[PDB]
């Protein structure tokens with residue numbers, strides 16, 4: 001497919017979100033779904049458009065599978081690639097580290113020459129700090145199934161609609 005979606009998940013939430021994103025884009029013919037646990041860093045090179053999904057764990061940490069491939073990311077040349085991000089988190093329980101993983105990954109990948117697309121508004125959430133915020137906007141879609149599951153569906157539909165324009169679809 002033209003879009004490669006790479007996600008990591010601990011309790012399956014991020015995978016379900018990934019599956020809904022693939023669905024909103026039009027299915028397997030448009031988006032390839034890849035679990036980062038089964039991938040090599042070089043797999044990210046095959047796509048000009050990428051969607052990176054990662055839940056924040058252990059108070060501001062990357063999900064373990066993303067943690068394991070993190071240092072390998074340097075071997076991939078992201079110059080020219082457009083990358084979008086999404087993450088699952090808990091704003092009430094982890095108010096000072098809400099969606100940190102998404103921010104850690106965005107900082108890393110953009111420093112490697114990629115272009116970040118898919119900025120999201122922070123107003124629909126209540127948290128103190130997040131490494132995923134730059135100039136009052138989230139660098140990607142923030143999902144909270146723990147406290148705002150009723151908003152997930154429309155958040156995905158709205159974000160994908162916005163992303164289609166960026167990806168030339």
Ligand SMILES: Cc1cc2nc3c(=O)[nH]c(=O)nc-3n(C[C@H](O)[C@H](O)[C@H](O)COP(=O)(O)O)c2cc1C
Pocket residue numbers: 008009010011012013014015055056057058059060061063088089090091094097098099100145146
């Ligand atoms: C031990 C533990 C630590 C967590 N730490 C954070 C955190 O630092 N920041 C955050 O936003 N959410 C945090 N969460 C919430 C998770 O990211 C959230 O439950 C998410 O849905 C998990 O997704 P997964 O099923 O894809 O792994 C934590 C959850 C648990 C159980």
